[PDB]
Amino acid sequence: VDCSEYPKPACTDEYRPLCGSDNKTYGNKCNFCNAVVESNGTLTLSHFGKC
Amino acid sequence: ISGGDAIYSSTGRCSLGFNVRSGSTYYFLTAGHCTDGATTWWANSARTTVLGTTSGSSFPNNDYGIVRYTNTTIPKDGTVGGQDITSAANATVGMAVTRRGSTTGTHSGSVTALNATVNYGGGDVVYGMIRTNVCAEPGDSGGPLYSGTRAIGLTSGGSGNCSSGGTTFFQPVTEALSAYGVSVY
């Protein structure tokens, strides 16, 4: 996953989880990427799927 | 199975919006973004119980899809969880509504605006959406928005979350019913 096209003002709500470096399971790519942005680039992807 | 319950496709989990029928043929509505590129749908993560296969999908522009049931024994309740649904109606500003989804359960709020355009990016723009102050989270897509016994919309997406609050957009259900020639029951 690439978060350059972010941030986005809205995200669809399908669930396909990603595991962030904060140990938080992000519900989908759009959610994860907006988090990355909000973290000012500090949050990374730990791995695909639930944490 | 009923409105708000989880549905799984080969790609992920969404929520069942409303059970609908045309003549003797049963289907279920859900989000078009969830029907897009999905063929078969199951009732569990294990994919052991089949529900049916995609029959239509409209996303972006609109956000609705319909799946035809192939599962003969599964109960197809005309409700949202325990709630009966008896008709469909148009959203109005100020309307008190309730959403049910597979991740967050039931949450209430109000219609704050109509005919909203939501831009999901990459060319995924949907139009004519109902804006509300109800939250929703990943997995909640395609769940029902209703008011009392009235079916009003399908969860499409938005921002924020249920802890801290958010804005969610729904596709008007009436349009979907009209397009597929089906009705709630």
Question: What summary fits the major beta sheet of chain A?
Answer: 3 strands, antiparallel
The secondary structure category of chain B is mainly beta
Number of helices of chain B: 2
> Number of folding domains of chain A?
1
Number of DSSP strand runs of chain A: 4
PDB class: hydrolase/hydrolase inhibitor
Keywords: complex (serine protease-inhibitor), serine proteinase, protein inhibitor, hydrolase-hydrolase inhibitor complex
Assembly: dimeric
Entry title: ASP 18 variant of turkey ovomucoid inhibitor third domain complexed with streptomyces griseus proteinase B at PH 6.5
Molecular structure report:
The complex is a heterodimer of chains A (51) and B (185). With 51 residues, chain A is of the alpha+beta class. Chain A has one domain (1-51): 2-Layer Sandwich (Wheat Germ Agglutinin (Isolectin 2), domain 1), CATH 3.30.60.30. Chain A has one helix at residues 29-38, and strands spanning 11-12, 18-20, 25-26, 45-48. In chain A, strands 3-2-4 form a three-stranded antiparallel beta sheet. The two termini of chain A are 16 Å apart. In chain B, a hairpin with a 3-residue loop joins β11 (96-101) and β12 (105-119). The longest helix of chain B is centred in the last third of the chain and has 8 residues, at 173-180. In chain B, 6% of the residues lie in helices and 52% in strands. Chain B folds into two domains: 1-77 and 173-185, Thrombin, subunit H (Beta Barrel); 78-172, Thrombin, subunit H (Beta Barrel). At the A-B interface, β1 and α1 of A face β15 of B. β1 (11-12) of chain A pairs antiparallel with β15 (150-161) of chain B, so a sheet runs across the interface.
